[PDB]
Amino acid sequence: ANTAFVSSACNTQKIPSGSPFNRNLRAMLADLRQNTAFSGYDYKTSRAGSGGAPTAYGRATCKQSISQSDCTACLSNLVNRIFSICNNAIGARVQLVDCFIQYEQRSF
Numbered sequence: 001a002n003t004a005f006v007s008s009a010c011n012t013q014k015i016p017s018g019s020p021f022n023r024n025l026r027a028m029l030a031d032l033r034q035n036t037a038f039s040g041y042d043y044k045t046s047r048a049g050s051g052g053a054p055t056a057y058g059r060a061t062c063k064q065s066i067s068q069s070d071c072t073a074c075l076s077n078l079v080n081r082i083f084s085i086c087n088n089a090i091g092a093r094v095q096l097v098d099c100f101i102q103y104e105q106r107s108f
């Protein structure tokens with residue numbers, strides 16, 4: 001399962017420390033993490049915010065040629081890196097070798 005970095009794009013705008021966004025955001029990334037291998041190696045989902053925070057939309061794809069476990073693995077690898085890559089942003093795309101994730105505060 002190849003998890004080497006390929007490309008990234010980051011919002012100039014960051015999630016405020018403590019922002020309620022953090023929760024539905026993370027909660028959504030796990031839906032991506034757990035379900036893409038089985039929803040066809042490219043999968044989108046969302047999470048409505050509470051307490052004034054926006055809704056969160058994201059998409060995730062795996063290298064078709066990789067396995068379901070290796071698809072689920074890369075995304076986990078990516079989820080714990082996408083915040084660092086983009087310094088806690090209100091939206092982002094990250095491309096690694098075997099898998100892709102994007103998240104934003106609107107629909108895309």
Ligand SMILES: OC[C@H]1O[C@H](O)[C@@H](O)[C@@H](O)[C@@H]1O
Binds near residue numbers: 010090093
């Ligand atoms: O994909 C993340 C980022 O990419 C570009 O910078 C723009 O489209 C932003 O508005 C978006 O948040």
